[PDB]
């Protein structure tokens, strides 16, 4: 049988190894309901892909632009040309409209599987969509799905889980030290016994609030550290 999440533990009845990356891990029994299990699988896939994109973006941004802090990169004054000091209202409007459209399409696909595959404007443009959360077609133009989709899906979910943990690590490292992941790694490599979680914890480098152009946005750390 497959290797579980712990030696000697017994996997739940609903976790028979059908989904990719199944380790029989469910201490809260949230997967007991099949509908809830499907929704949680979609949520896990979304979190995994978004976290992988965020981790890759933070790393590439720190490599290409080391003088820009990723935590404060959302400020309009830190945006690159020609988007510097741009109005955030129009930007939020653009993102809201586009993301709302794509997320409503994805949600409708979840509610009714295989019902929004066709393009609503140009008829005939459809995606195969063999499983929920795996549309394919235009989303996979390189044709990497015509093989062992199970092992590839396992690799995707495992890399996504690792990226989720890594992104939260980046967030807490930035909230406790005020620097990016590569900067924190270099600082720890300079003196491992002086720069670590033993001393960096308890201090919250994030300010109380920030005035984004006209309105103020409140900020806080994940733990009650010293401001």
């Amino acid at each position: 049988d497959r290797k579980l999440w712990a030696p000697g533990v017994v996997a739940p009845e609903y976790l028979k190894g059908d989904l990719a990356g199944d380790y029989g891990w469910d201490p809260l029994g949230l997967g007991a309901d099949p509908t809830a299990l499907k929704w949680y699988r979609q949520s896990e896939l979304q979190h995994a892909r978004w976290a992988m994109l965020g981790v890759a973006g933070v790393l590439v941004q720190e490599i290409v632009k080391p003088d820009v802090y990723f935590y404060e990169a959302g400020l309009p004054q830190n945006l690159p040309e020609p988007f510097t000091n741009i109005n955030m209202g129009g930007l939020l409007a653009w993102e809201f409209i586009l993301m709302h459209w794509v997320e409503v399409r994805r949600w409708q696909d979840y509610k009714n599987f295989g019902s929004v595959n066709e393009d609503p404007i140009f008829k005939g443009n459809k995606v195969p969509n063999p499983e929920m959360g795996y549309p394919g077609g235009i989303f996979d133009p390189f044709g990497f799905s015509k093989g062992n989709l199970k092992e590839l899906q396992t690799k995707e979910i495992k890399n996504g889980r690792l990226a989720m943990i890594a992104y939260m690590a980046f967030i807490l490292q930035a909230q406790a030290t005020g620097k990016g992941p590569l900067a924190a790694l270099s600082a720890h490599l300079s003196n491992p016994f002086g720069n670590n979680i033993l001393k960096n914890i308890g201090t919250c480098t994030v300010p109380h609030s920030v005035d984004v152009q006209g309105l103020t946005i409140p900020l806080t750390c994940l733990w009650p550290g010293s401001q």
């Binding site: 000697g8 533990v9 029994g29 949230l30 309901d33 308890g202």
Partner: protein, 219 residues
């Protein structure tokens, strides 16, 4: 087995319960004409609950002083257990994220949810596994014994699969809990007597045992 045992207690103490050493000179587990709260199920349940709470209490009352003596935690923290905000006349800590009453209200809601659901599993065995609780009812089914519910969360690593292993671990748990209960009683008595932390009392006693004891601390 232990001192103070008698033939009266040995009639109903056959060794089935964990930690059964035949020590009951007051006859509190007599099943004949028993009721209310003085009955074997409630008494055993209360003993294991006190055991776990006292284990957490002993570890939490000695951890900040020990960690502060080693330099792992700063000097702002590392205060006595009775000066952390428990008893304001004895001392309080103002470094929390909110006042102790706000945190106390949060604790009221949290503890009421946990304790009331636990009580319902004791009163109605398995009743916490049917009503919707955001999918958490799958791990609140419990078992026959309210003191040992188990499940995917309460038994996370599935420890004690064998009956003998479970009995061994239960005996270890009750013994550690009884030791922790005695330790908590000693912590309170030392706090009232010496007015210092338990770790400080242990260090002072190890430095000079003849001149640092309950006899010399009377005056």
């Amino acid at each position: 087995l232990y001192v103070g045992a008698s033939q009266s207690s040995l009639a109903y103490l056959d060794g089935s319960l964990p930690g059964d050493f035949g020590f009951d000179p007051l006859g509190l587990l007599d099943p004949v004409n028993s009721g209310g709260f003085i009955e074997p199920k409630w008494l055993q349940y209360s003993e294991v609950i006190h055991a776990r709470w006292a284990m957490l209490g002993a570890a939490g009352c000695i951890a900040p002083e020990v960690l502060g003596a080693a330099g792992l935690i700063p000097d702002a923290t590392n205060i006595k257990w009775f000066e952390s905000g428990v008893i304001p006349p004895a001392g309080s800590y103002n470094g929390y994220w909110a006042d102790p009453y706000t945190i106390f209200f949060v604790e009221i809601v949290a503890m009421q949810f946990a304790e009331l659901r636990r009580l319902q599993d004791f009163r109605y065995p398995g009743s916490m596994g049917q009503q919707y609780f955001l999918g958490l009812e799958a791990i609140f089914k419990g078992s026959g014994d309210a003191a040992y519910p188990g499940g995917p969360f309460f038994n996370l690593f599935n420890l004690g699969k064998t009956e003998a292993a479970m009995k061994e671990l239960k005996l270890k748990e009750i013994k550690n809990g009884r030791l922790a209960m005695l330790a908590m009683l000693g912590y309170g008595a030392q706090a009232v007597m010496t007015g210092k932390g338990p770790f400080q009392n242990l260090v002072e006693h190890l430095a000079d045992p003849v001149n640092n004891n309950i006899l010399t601390n009377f005056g």
